[PDB]
Enzyme design. Structure first.
Site, PDB file in Angstrom:
ATOM      1  N   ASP A 180       0.856  -1.166   0.000  1.00 39.57           N
ATOM      2  CA  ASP A 180       0.000   0.000   0.000  1.00 39.57           C
ATOM      3  C   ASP A 180       0.918   1.251   0.000  1.00 39.57           C
ATOM      4  O   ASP A 180       2.083   1.150   0.474  1.00 39.57           O
ATOM      5  CB  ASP A 180      -0.946   0.037   1.205  1.00 39.57           C
ATOM      6  CG  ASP A 180      -1.789   1.270   1.444  1.00 39.57           C
ATOM      7  OD1 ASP A 180      -1.938   2.095   0.448  1.00 39.57           O
ATOM      8  OD2 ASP A 180      -2.350   1.557   2.522  1.00 39.57           O
ATOM      9  N   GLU A 207      -1.786  22.277  -0.065  1.00 35.91           N
ATOM     10  CA  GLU A 207      -2.086  23.699   0.048  1.00 35.91           C
ATOM     11  C   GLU A 207      -1.523  24.313   1.322  1.00 35.91           C
ATOM     12  O   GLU A 207      -1.070  25.460   1.306  1.00 35.91           O
ATOM     13  CB  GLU A 207      -3.596  23.923  -0.001  1.00 35.91           C
ATOM     14  CG  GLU A 207      -4.003  25.260  -0.573  1.00 35.91           C
ATOM     15  CD  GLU A 207      -5.410  25.241  -1.118  1.00 35.91           C
ATOM     16  OE1 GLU A 207      -6.353  25.011  -0.334  1.00 35.91           O
ATOM     17  OE2 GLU A 207      -5.573  25.451  -2.336  1.00 35.91           O
ATOM     18  N   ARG A 246       6.471  17.384  -7.457  1.00 35.53           N
ATOM     19  CA  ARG A 246       5.106  17.564  -7.935  1.00 35.53           C
ATOM     20  C   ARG A 246       4.800  19.053  -8.061  1.00 35.53           C
ATOM     21  O   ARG A 246       4.825  19.786  -7.068  1.00 35.53           O
ATOM     22  CB  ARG A 246       4.148  16.816  -6.999  1.00 35.53           C
ATOM     23  CG  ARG A 246       4.196  17.263  -5.548  1.00 35.53           C
ATOM     24  CD  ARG A 246       3.343  16.410  -4.620  1.00 35.53           C
ATOM     25  NE  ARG A 246       1.910  16.531  -4.835  1.00 35.53           N
ATOM     26  CZ  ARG A 246       1.018  15.682  -4.338  1.00 35.53           C
ATOM     27  NH1 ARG A 246       1.419  14.656  -3.608  1.00 35.53           N
ATOM     28  NH2 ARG A 246      -0.273  15.857  -4.572  1.00 35.53           N
ATOM     29  N   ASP A 298      -5.192   6.043  -3.529  1.00 37.56           N
ATOM     30  CA  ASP A 298      -5.056   7.468  -3.778  1.00 37.56           C
ATOM     31  C   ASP A 298      -5.203   7.759  -5.271  1.00 37.56           C
ATOM     32  O   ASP A 298      -5.320   6.854  -6.097  1.00 37.56           O
ATOM     33  CB  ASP A 298      -3.721   7.968  -3.238  1.00 37.56           C
ATOM     34  CG  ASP A 298      -3.737   9.447  -2.924  1.00 37.56           C
ATOM     35  OD1 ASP A 298      -4.699  10.133  -3.323  1.00 37.56           O
ATOM     36  OD2 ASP A 298      -2.789   9.928  -2.272  1.00 37.56           O
TER      37      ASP A 298
HETATM   38 MG   LIG Z   1      -2.640   2.994   3.928  1.00 36.40          MG
END
Ligand SMILES: [Mg+2]
Ligand SMILES: *[C@@H]1O[C@H](CO)[C@@H](O[C@@H]2O[C@H](CO)[C@@H](O[C@H]3O[C@H](CO)[C@@H](O)[C@H](O)[C@@H]3O)[C@H](O)[C@H]2NC(C)=O)[C@H](O)[C@H]1NC(C)=O
Ligand SMILES: *[C@@H]1O[C@H](CO)[C@@H](O[C@@H]2O[C@H](CO)[C@@H](O)[C@H](O)[C@H]2NC(C)=O)[C@H](O)[C@H]1NC(C)=O
Ligand SMILES: *[C@@H]1O[C@H](CO)[C@@H](O)[C@H](O)[C@H]1NC(C)=O
Ligand SMILES: *[C@@H]1O[C@H](CO)[C@@H](O)[C@H](O)[C@H]1NC(C)=O
Lengths: 1162, 331
Positions: A407, A508, A605, A687
């Site tokens: 994960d 942010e 990013r 995600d």
């Molecule tokens: Mg996780």
């Protein structure tokens, strides 16, 4: 309806639940409960307790025996317990062949209950978390376990949600609560939950919360996580509900103070606990081998006992009844003597695969699982976690792993952003100094001793950037940093002066805190204004519009008026969509993109920043259009989009930013070693699709020169393999070979980014609408002609062949990443790899959405140390950092397979060289089944004389040290192809046991057919012929365990010379009379040499012709250099510039324009 | 959570240890050291074993040509068959006289267990009550058997007498000793007479005689010390054999102080009271005379085995030196 690839397809996986407010006895009515066979009965509404153990109180005995007798040997011993109790052929006094069996069953059952009490203790740390509940009057403390359906509970900030609650009040304006779901679906952004419109304005208070005659008619527990269709029957024309008003279990309350809620589901009825299920009993790959051995030994034993019972028949009628001395009062026929001795030869020849097998295996496997949690070098000092081993039965399978599924969020990453560097008008900032003053001097971090709100949090190194904003000599820099503090949605929350930022995005809050460290601090915002104090001077702009962020807009913008009276548009977003909205006069349109290449070349990013002057007249014609479509019925989300980009043209660039995502201390260099030991790694995450690609670049799974091959590409490459080239597709070829080469041209390193929505399309697994079939299966809608359609489906033709094609394609991708996958799509992927191309699989992760995948893999690991420990309680091992996967696999894994493959090889040689002497002796006593040893030696051989030296070997042996076992990960390959011990190397340890039992008998037989003494003390009897063989057997089988151990401790040599000395010591009759003579002490020495000298000449001859790769490492152990490699793979640029791939990534949601609606401030 | 584990060297898997590796000069010179000890020892045995003088008679009269053929199925007073053998070479030192058998399975499981060790240990209680393991020979006409079991039932009872005919009308009765032919721990520990007075007739009061015997155990020998369960000819038979073809000690032929050939060269006669019927099951009987040595007996299997093992092992240390040299610093 194309795959949305943004939605996590929880699909394709009002029924009167009736919570009814309090009423703690409404749910106890007999028309809800379920009745069972005996007086103990359950109810329809479950309690809020968690049970992960296996044996509760009194199912321990029936259940543990069932999995005790899953081993073929425990039937082998039981069958002989019955066969040794019949009195006609019993060969035994009172029952001494049952207590040994009970004690063997009484050791594996107590080792399997010490293990299941620690798991019975781990559940105690959840059910005692003390979240407040209302009993009758006020709020009182109460544990999680004593919460039931229909309770009004109160929660605090940073607290865990105990059950599925319906939010109905809070301390925030309009009663909305913010929550993060990093444990449910891997996302790192906050998601606001807004309560109902009627409950907020009336309850809002503890005193009137004790009186609540509510009613719910929601749906049933259905592991959906995003639907919740149901209504609230308060009173008098009820209100509806939705998933926007539901808080699930594994969440965490954030950025609020206290909230209240009802309890809709509880315990194993919650929507996260229905996704983790179907626990099973796990058995290693050697356990399926120790079964086929006993099935082969038992077949051999039946043949030998049947070929020696024929000989006793033909002999009892040829030499047997003529012999007068062998007279017995019975009158049994010679053909019945043979039958009665066949059972006598199963009792005698049974001490191969003896009872001391599963005792000395579960002592080797108990001392190897204690070397994992005593490891001082798998211990995480910061959080004080010792890397426990939780199963103590799967140790030898750690050294056989083929695939690893991991994960991302929380396991590979540690959830920190840390603004890194920026580009302003072409030139980047923040390399190391990039300055004039303090350039060749030290690289100390710059001092933010000039900002009042500096709070010394950001780590920066560039002198030039921070001085150029003090001078103000370059106008186009302060404009950049002012934009970072205006184009966002952060909330400020000040207790006393000190200012905090309640950002609902991780990406942010990194930028806003970055700005504040260079002045330009964001103070407050009412509903229409934003107050900013840049470089001390404080100014108050007003906000005319907010064109908020979206999933497919990829940008956010704001229109402000300066106090002077100038209106302008600020904007930020992706690099590929701002470049189709910028003016065609920028000189820096290329230089910034060059920085984007460098920023994307490293693993960062990136975002692009721009603005535009909004004139003073086109605004009013647009402001009218904005307010016009702002309120609308259905074209209010998509027609407002047509207004959003009405003003986006003619933008001018300022530069770009770059945020990092800290991985963990030593993740990329763990993956390099694991990939070098020939282990394939897949990343299954929840995600977004852009963050899974950023991490795939950071941890070096997919570097430069790696074709990505996104999901929409695969479904076409697999339709040019099935829809053609089987029997159709234009011109038939009559061959149709699906083996052409590989699905791919040679060249390798072709990664595979697949979204969960596309994974449901590629594998032909969906849910279809109702309107596909007419009716049910019955002889009317379908004729009696063998059910031609509702029973002939033909789905299993394509489906099984489509899954087979997919797994065959992913065998050569060198990296696979799956994103936005349901918690039970992760398990399905693990199960397609361990069905086709069978492989031992591992699964490491944390959080409640990895529990299903951990239970399905052969070995499951769980990351511990954080507060969310859901994925630990269902695991098999649980350390605290991803980088400890090196030692669990390359040290504790491949040692534990070497030590178990050496114990098994030697255990089936010491017992075939002992029990098979009675086979050769039978030809010299008329096949009478009479033992060639004494009786005290048979019951003390595999207990005292030869039982310790192999136990001290199975616990201490080690091939090469743990320092250069990591340095050469290629040694792991021996235990992964099944090379050290398989079914072809088990038949060599029998042929080595039938040759030893032959030399050990026929050498003492050659010396006894003639004289050995004369004086009248001469031992030539049966007593001394069973001492010559016995004493030449202990010496031999205790030397073959000295040639095997390659790591001689002290206790490992006091146990070999302490077993031979315990035999000659306890035995000093015939003992002190046959060992006192020169000719006996020459049959023993000759017998040992003949059966021990050729097993050295095969180990030396098989080490200098075909040396194993573990032998070359030992030869040059003292002739090798050092290494400190893996820096970063500096790949500064390339001449073949072709990637130009956008590094865009942004974790945020849509709809956070709560500000413009009602200014959610105070 | 469970503060750091201890640093003791056992728990960290770093115990002090010796790591051996089979190099060239460790397993190559073990195939030679063995090869120069096993051949000398294999000649010492063979040369020593060759000088023990041994003779076998095989007085079973299966063939019509043997003088003992007249007693295979006798019907009269006990037989006496005589065999003439000659010692072409002299015997010196001490001489041992054995008797041999063949096809006699004294290691059969139905026969080995058929005894009662409590009774033979002078037990006053179980003497009147033998155990059930000897069931065929456990009881008689309301009387228990003193030597109980199928082992003591079939004791060897032939009588062998040796005569030196160095001159006719005077066959010399060569002196044979019948005491001292049993394990020293059998005559003094394992086998004991019942604890009575001084008359063995009273110690065995009420117990019968074995079925196949001719006189009760209390009169096996006239020596009052060597009589009953402590008898030495009885003890030797009780100590069962290990293979079908065995030999058991019978008598000793002592020597004299003057240096003389204890069995002098010349012709001899063996005078046999044939009683034991082995011919039914293809049995064979033998009488054996052997001499002593400081090593053992005439055992030539070890002598050849060491020469064969000590040469094959030697011829491996050569073919493991033309291969180690060829394949080192190479493939
Ligand atoms: Mg996780
Ligand atoms: C030497 O040992 C011999 C061992 O077999 C023994 O032969 C056995 O002699 C007994 C005499 O008690 C016989 O027993 C039975 O014989 C007659 C038949 O003539 C039966 O009718 C009787 O019931 C009696 O119990 C055995 O049959 C016989 N064994 C064989 C195989 O024939 C010699 O007697 C012994 N000689 C001695 C002690 O001088
Ligand atoms: C040989 O076999 C026969 C028959 O199987 C045995 O003879 C039986 O022995 C029992 C034992 O007491 C008697 O009850 C029977 O009456 C006998 N039957 C016959 C037909 O003789 C004999 O015991 C065996 N052994 C020998 C002859 O040594
Ligand atoms: C021993 O020899 C004598 C005479 O040589 C003869 O009667 C028979 O062979 C044997 N007699 C006795 C009693 O042993
Ligand atoms: C055996 O030798 C004796 C002399 O003691 C002789 O009388 C007899 O005839 C011989 N018998 C045989 C068969 O040689």
């Amino acid at each position: 309806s194309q795959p949305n690839d943004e939605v996590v397809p929880y699909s394709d996986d009002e029924c009167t639940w009736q919570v009814k407010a309090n009423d703690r006895k409404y749910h106890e009515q007999p028309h809800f409960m379920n009745t069972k066979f005996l007086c103990i009965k359950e109810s329809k509404y479950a309690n809020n307790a968690i049970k992960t153990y296996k044996y509760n109180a009194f199912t321990f005995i029936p259940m543990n025996l069932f999995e005790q007798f899953k081993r073929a040997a425990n039937l082998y011993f039981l069958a002989l317990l019955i066969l040794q109790a019949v009195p006609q052929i019993s060969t035994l006094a009172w029952y001494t062949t049952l207590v040994p069996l009970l004690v063997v069953l009484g050791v594996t059952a107590i080792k399997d209950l010490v293990d299941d009490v620690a798991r019975h203790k781990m559940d105690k740390e959840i059910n005692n978390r003390t979240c407040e509940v209302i009993k009758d009057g006020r709020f009182k403390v109460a544990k999680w376990k004593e919460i039931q359906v229909g309770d009004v509970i109160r929660l605090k900030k940073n607290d865990f949600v105990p059950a599925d609650i319906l939010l109905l009040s809070s301390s925030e304006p309009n009663s909305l609560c913010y929550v993060e779901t990093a444990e449910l679906d891997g996302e790192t952004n906050l998601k606001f939950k807004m309560s109902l419109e009627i409950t907020d304005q009336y309850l809002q208070r503890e005193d009137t919360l004790a009186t609540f005659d509510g009613f719910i008619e929601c749906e049933e527990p259905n592991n959906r996580l995003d639907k919740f269709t149901g209504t609230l029957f308060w009173r008098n024309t009820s209100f509806p509900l939705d998933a926007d008003k539901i808080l699930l279990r594994g969440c965490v309350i954030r950025n609020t103070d206290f909230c209240h809620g009802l309890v809709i589901f509880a315990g194993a009825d919650t929507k996260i606990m229905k996704n983790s299920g179907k626990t099973r009993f796990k058995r290693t790959k050697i356990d399926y081998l120790m079964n086929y051995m006993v099935y082969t030994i038992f077949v051999v034993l039946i043949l030998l006992s049947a070929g020696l019972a024929i000989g006793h028949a033909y002999w009892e009628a040829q030499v047997g009844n003529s012999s007068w001395y062998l007279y017995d009062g019975e009158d049994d026929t010679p053909s019945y003597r043979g039958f009665l001795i066949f059972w006598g030869y199963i009792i005698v020849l049974n001490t191969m695969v003896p009872i001391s097998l599963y005792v000395s295996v579960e002592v080797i496997r108990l001392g190897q699982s204690h070397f994992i949690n005593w490891d001082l070098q798998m211990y995480y000092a910061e959080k004080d976690t010792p890397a426990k081993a939780r199963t103590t039965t799967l140790n030898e399978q750690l050294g056989q792993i083929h695939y690893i599924f991991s994960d991302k969020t929380g396991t590979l990453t540690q959830n920190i952003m840390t603004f890194k560097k920026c580009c302003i008008n072409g030139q980047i900032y923040g390399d190391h100094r990039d300055a004039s003053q303090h350039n060749h001097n030290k690289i100390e971090q710059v001092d933010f001793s000039w900002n009042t709100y500096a709070d010394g949090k950001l780590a920066f190194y560039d002198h030039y950037l921070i001085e150029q904003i003090q001078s103000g000599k370059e106008p186009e820099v302060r404009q950049f940093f002012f934009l970072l503090a205006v184009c966002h949605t952060v909330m400020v929350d000040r207790t006393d002066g000190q200012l905090n930022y309640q950002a609902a995005s991780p990406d942010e809050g990194a930028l806003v805190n970055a700005a504040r460290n260079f002045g330009f601090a964001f103070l407050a915002r009412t509903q229409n204004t934003i107050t900013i104090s840049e470089l001390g001077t404080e100014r108050t702009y007003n906000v005319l519009a907010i064109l908020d962020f979206n999933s497919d807009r990829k940008r956010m913008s704001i229109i402000v008026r300066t106090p002077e009276g100038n209106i302008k548009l600020y904007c930020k977003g992706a690099d590929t969509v701002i470049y189709e909205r910028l003016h065609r006069m920028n000189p820096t349109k290329q230089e910034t993109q060059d920085a984007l290449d460098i920023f994307a070349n490293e693993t960062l990013r990136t975002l692009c920043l721009c603005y535009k002057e909004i004139e003073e007249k086109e605004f009013t014609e647009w402001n009218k259009k904005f307010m016009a479509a702002s309120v609308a019925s259905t074209n209010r989300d998509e027609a407002l989009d047509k207004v959003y980009e009405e003003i986006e043209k003619d933008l001018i660039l300022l530069g770009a930013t770059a945020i990092e995502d800290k991985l963990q201390d030593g993740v990329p260099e763990t993956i390099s070693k694991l990939a070098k030991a020939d282990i394939k790694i897949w990343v299954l995450t929840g995600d977004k699709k852009e963050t899974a690609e950023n991490i795939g670049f950071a941890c070096e799974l997919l570097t430069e020169d790696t074709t990505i091959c996104y999901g929409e590409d695969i479904n076409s490459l697999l339709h040019a393999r099935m829809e053609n080239q089987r029997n159709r597709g234009g011109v038939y070829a009559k061959f149709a070979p699906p083996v052409q080469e590989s699905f791919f041209p040679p060249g390798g390193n072709r990664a595979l980014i697949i979204t969960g929505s596309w994974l449901n399309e590629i594998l032909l697994e969906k849910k279809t609408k109702r309107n596909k079939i007419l009716k049910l299966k019955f002889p009317r809608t379908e004729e009696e002609r063998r059910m031609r359609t509702q029973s002939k489906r033909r789905l299993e033709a394509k489906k099984e062949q489509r899954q087979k094609n997919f797994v065959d394609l992913a065998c050569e991708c060198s990296a696979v990443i799956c994103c936005r996958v349901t918690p039970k799509q992760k398990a399905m992927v693990v199960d397609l790899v361990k069905r086709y191309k069978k492989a031992i699989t591992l699964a490491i992760g944390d959080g409640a959405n990895d529990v299903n995948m951990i239970k399905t893999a052969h070995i499951g690991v769980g990351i511990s140390g954080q507060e969310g420990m859901q994925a630990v309680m269902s695991s098999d091992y649980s350390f605290a950092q991803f980088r400890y996967l090196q030692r669990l696999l390359l040290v504790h894994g491949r040692w534990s397979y070497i030590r178990m493959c050496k114990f098994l090889r030697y255990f089936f040689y010491k017992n075939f060289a002992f029990t098979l002497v009675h086979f050769w002796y039978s030809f010299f006593n008329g096949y009478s089944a009479q033992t060639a040893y004494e009786d005290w030696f048979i019951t003390l051989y595999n207990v005292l004389y030869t039982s310790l030296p192999v136990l001290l070997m199975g616990l201490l042996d080690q091939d090469v040290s743990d320092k250069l076992s990591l340095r050469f990960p290629g040694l792991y390959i021996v235990g992964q192809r099944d090379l050290l011990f398989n079914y072809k190397r088990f038949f060599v340890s029998l042929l080595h046991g039938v040759l030893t039992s032959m030399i050990l008998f026929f050498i003492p037989l050659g010396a006894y057919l003639q004289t050995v003494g004369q004086d009248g003390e001469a031992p030539s009897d049966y007593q001394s012929f069973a001492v010559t063989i016995a004493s030449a057997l202990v010496i031999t089988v205790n030397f073959q365990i000295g040639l095997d151990t390659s790591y001689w401790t002290f206790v490992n040599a006091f146990s070999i010379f302490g077993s031979i000395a315990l035999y000659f010591g306890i035995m000093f009759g015939t003992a002190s009379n046959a060992l006192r003579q020169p000719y006996i002490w020459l049959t023993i020495i000759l017998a040992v040499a003949v059966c021990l000298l050729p097993v050295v000449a095969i180990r030396f001859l098989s080490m200098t012709i075909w040396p194993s790769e573990s032998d070359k490492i030992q030869k040059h152990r003292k002739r090798l250099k050092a290494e400190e490699q893996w820096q970063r793979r500096q790949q500064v640029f390339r001449r073949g510039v072709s990637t130009r791939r956008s590094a865009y990534a942004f974790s945020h949601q849509r709809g956070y324009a709560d500000l413009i609606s009602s200014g959610r401030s105070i | 959570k469970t503060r750091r584990p201890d640093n003791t060297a056992f728990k960290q898997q770093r115990l002090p240890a010796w790591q051996p590796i089979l190099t060239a000069g460790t397993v190559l010179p073990i195939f030679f050291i063995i090869g120069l000890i096993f051949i000398p020892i294999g000649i010492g045995i063979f040369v020593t074993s060759n000088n023990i003088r041994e003779i076998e008679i095989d007085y079973t009269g299966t063939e019509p040509s043997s003088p003992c053929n007249k007693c295979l199925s006798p019907d009269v007073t006990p037989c006496f068959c005589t065999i003439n053998f000659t010692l072409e070479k002299s015997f010196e030192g001490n001489v041992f006289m054995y008797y041999g058998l063949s096809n006699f399975y004294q290691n059969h499981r139905r026969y080995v267990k058929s005894r009662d060790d409590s009774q033979l240990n002078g037990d006053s209680s179980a003497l009147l009550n033998p155990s059930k393991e000897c069931e065929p020979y456990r009881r008689n006409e309301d009387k228990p058997i003193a030597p109980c079991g199928a082992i003591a039932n079939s004791m060897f009872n032939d009588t062998l007498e040796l005569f030196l005919i160095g001159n006719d009308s005077y066959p010399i009765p060569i002196a044979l000793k019948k005491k001292g032919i049993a394990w020293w721990t059998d005559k003094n520990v394992k086998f004991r007479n019942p604890p009575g007075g001084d008359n063995l007739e009273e110690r065995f009061k009420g117990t019968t005689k074995p079925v196949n015997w001719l006189k009760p155990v209390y009169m096996l020998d006239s020596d009052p010390d060597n009589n009953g369960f402590i008898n030495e000819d009885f003890i030797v038979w009780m100590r069962t054999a290990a293979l079908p073809t065995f030999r058991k000690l019978y008598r000793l032929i002592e020597r004299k102080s003057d240096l003389h050939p204890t069995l002098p060269a010349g012709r001899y006669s063996l005078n046999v009271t044939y009683n034991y019927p082995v011919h039914y099951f293809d049995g064979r009987k033998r009488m054996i005379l052997s001499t002593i040595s400081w090593m053992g007996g005439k055992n030539p299997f070890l002598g050849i085995a060491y020469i064969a093992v000590g040469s094959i092992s030697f011829l491996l240390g050569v073919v493991l030196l033309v291969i180690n040299h060829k394949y080192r610093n190479s493939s």
